[PDB]
Amino acid sequence: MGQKINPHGFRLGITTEWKSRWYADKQYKDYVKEDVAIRKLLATGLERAGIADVEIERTRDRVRVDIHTARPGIVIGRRGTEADRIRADLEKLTGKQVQLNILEVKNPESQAQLVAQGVAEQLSNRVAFRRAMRKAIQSAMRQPNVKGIRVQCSGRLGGAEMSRSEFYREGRVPLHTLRADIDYGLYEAKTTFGRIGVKVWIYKGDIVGG
């Protein structure tokens, strides 16, 4: 809706980190190719399982993936049926092995991406988007080491035709302040009528992080 710049995309080298931290001469192309291929492969699985961030690093001809799952148990089921299955799928789709190592998050309500995934799933489950956003804000403000939140679900809300963008906020969510350490989440929900956008902001605290 607005022209506000992505805080993560702006502070990718000041406050926030990078999801792809590697370097290669003439091979960065193939590196990012394999990265986006793995991302597209894990999209459906880790979305049905709950995903926050997929940090991929490149080593001497091998890979180092770190996926931040929210609900462990769906993707990690029986040892040799789901995890090893997806590992073998990634390996046979790429030209190398995969030493997959999952890392569990500390609080799903504290991560912006997870809150966006949850609110989008709620909206797609044929529920009141207003109540869904309210409960998500309550969960994310129930003292998860946070100080502010701002949730927005744009697009064709309620399966209507008008692009209603409900602006819901709570606490302190400054965008012009650099010393914010604000987490951002951008999600695209698919419905039977079209697409919907979910923009979330979680101002955890005023930590410098220098």
Partner: protein
Amino acid sequence: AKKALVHKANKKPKFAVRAYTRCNKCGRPHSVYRKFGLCRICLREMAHAGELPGVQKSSW
């Protein structure tokens, strides 16, 4: 745009007249700009991720 065609068109081709782009990421022979040797999709993906050598979009 498969591995065989990519390997056949990247090295010395049979006839010199075959000097098309033959991108390395997607492999499509056309619809790719030789300015960067990449198809628009991955080109802009890397541009937004901050990986391609110097491509960006609106700020003014």
